[PDB]
Amino acid sequence: PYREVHGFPVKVKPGAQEKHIPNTPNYKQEIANGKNKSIFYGDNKTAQELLDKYAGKGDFLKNGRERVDFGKPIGKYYDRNTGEYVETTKGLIHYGKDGAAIVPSRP
């Protein structure tokens, strides 16, 4: 049973979430393309558990985009001013028809 938030399913979109998970195909292709994605800790099951608890419980900034303070580290944000990573408790849930992804954001 997947609940919905403003018409969007509370379910991980695997390919979108994997862009932030090291050693996945999609992450490795982002890095090969010259991107430095912020890193999401854990795997797609970690992401689904966070979505179950927090989707709809943050603050929307646009339709389909919700900021959540998760209250514990969820990953590391890529600081473009330094090229290094900073541990973060904040994420932006990006919702779509095919599911959602948690993008770790600047602390």
Binding site: K37, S38, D59, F60, L61, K62, G64, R65, R67, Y78, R80, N81, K90, G91, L92, H94, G96, V103, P104, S105, R106, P107
Partner: protein, 108 residues
């Protein structure tokens, strides 16, 4: 690095900031976070665009635009949230000011 607007918001992350628009919208608020995002289109779409955006917490609307054509004000005026997305990609502001009036970013 960041584009000039996101760079400015991060530089003054500890400030109350005044954002102005050519439309006449003026708000005051604070930076909440910054995140990597895109414009929702398919990666094959020739209009697909990736960008950095700010989540900006609006503490007060200082001036309402006389028309309702900007996406930022159309979000704020529903009151479903006082957080709004700020970026150069979509409905950019024209100026960022400190509360002493100093202009720290202006659009090109």
């Amino acid at each position: 690095g960041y584009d000039s607007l996101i760079e400015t918001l991060i530089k003054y992350e500890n400030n109350d900031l005044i954002l102005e628009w050519t439309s006449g919208l003026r708000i005051i608020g604070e930076l909440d976070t910054v995140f990597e995002t895109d414009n929702g289109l398919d990666e094959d779409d020739n209009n697909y665009t990736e960008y950095d955006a700010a989540a900006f917490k609006v503490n007060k609307i200082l001036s309402k635009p006389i028309q309702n054509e900007g996406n930022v004000y159309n979000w704020l005026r529903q009151e479903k949230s006082s957080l709004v997305e700020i970026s150069l990609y979509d409905d950019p502001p024209s100026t960022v000011l400190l509360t002493d009036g100093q202009r720290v970013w202006k659009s090109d």
